[PDB]
Design a protein around this ligand. Structure first.
Ligand SMILES: [Mn+2]
Ligand SMILES: [Mn+2]
Lengths: 198, 197
């Protein structure tokens, strides 16, 4: 059975970029709900013993009776699990992926602008991703709890742009949330995901 | 062409069921954005001189170039235009539609139970609606800014269950938001929409 992972830091460690109250509710309620519903769905089946990464990567192969339940709640569990580890109070804009970004986009700023444009343009609930697509870096957004893994693209950075992730602090100002995000990116975790790619 | 309508009451009117901050931002930012984007999409096209009800009812016939934009922002403008009119500080649980709910569901409570259930079960962003479908009432939910008018079902009540509609006051507790909504339903507007059905 899947478990809610502890945050790698205190609920207020990401202030003033993400507020304590959001980290608490987002982790203890929203993510916890995804875990509950995922467990109910796969309870006493083959999937119960697989990694959430392998389940989401091979969604198309999940029994049709529960496929959507696993897509949404399995997606939720993986996405938020990645998100907690991708955030840090000790963000350093350096490493393997930062260097690769500087080469491909010309600057970290130019990449941040494209990511922020894509993230703001995602109408409704979803995520903005940096992915490795066949060795190349690409920015893509997905609806709901969908994950590029399912489409054979490895995600190495994700931003949750569901309104529950930003509304208490930023209300309608999603662009301001996206700007604050850069201050708490764990580029060490980004490098880790990139290096484990394919 | 399309204008942001004024609320028919003060930002504070629906307290303590819906907070003042949310009424102001939901209307002055979120709805206003739908209007801006809608005007941009239809500018210098047939749609500029049509009712929003017409456009959303005949969405499939919008040029494919701009259909998604009109769907999302035209939808936004209709759904919020309805929503502001479907709220009031002077809610009274009586009228044509309340009587018909009592007839069909056996009690207003039975209806509220189904509505709350559907509204709570809508994964992600969307709306929960009471519709007239071929002369009969039905509860349905839509994703994003989709409206049952497009499916040929007349909406007579709507609840916004996008997180921006409830997150400031209720956060994750969507069911508490849904429960509070009953205190501010404009059943006179529900009757007006049902009669014009
Ligand atoms: Mn989330
Ligand atoms: Mn809304």
């Amino acid at each position: 059975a899947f478990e809610l992972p502890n945050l790698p830091y205190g609920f207020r460690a990401l202030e003033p970029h993400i507020d304590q109250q959001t980290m608490e509710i987002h982790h203890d309620k929203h993510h916890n709900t995804y875990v509950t519903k995922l467990n109910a769905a796969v309870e006493g089946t083959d999937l119960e013993s697989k990694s959430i990464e392998e389940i989401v990567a091979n969604l198309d192969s999940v029994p049709e009776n529960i496929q959507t339940a696993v897509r949404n709640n399995g997606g939720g569990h993986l996405n938020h699990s990645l998100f907690w580890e991708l955030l840090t109070p000790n963000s350093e804009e350096k490493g393997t992926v930062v260097d690769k970004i500087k080469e491909q986009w010309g600057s970290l700023d130019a990449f941040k602008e494209e990511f922020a444009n894509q993230a703001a343009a995602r109408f409704g609930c979803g995520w903005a991703w940096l992915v490795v697509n066949d060795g190349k870096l690409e920015i893509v957004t997905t609806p709901n709890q969908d994950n590029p893994l399912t489409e054979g693209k490895t995600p190495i950075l994700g931003l949750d742009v569901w309104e529950h992730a930003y509304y208490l602090k930023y209300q309608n100002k999603r662009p301001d949330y996206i700007s604050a995000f850069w201050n708490v990116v764990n580029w060490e975790k980004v490098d880790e995901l990139y290096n484990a790619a394919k």
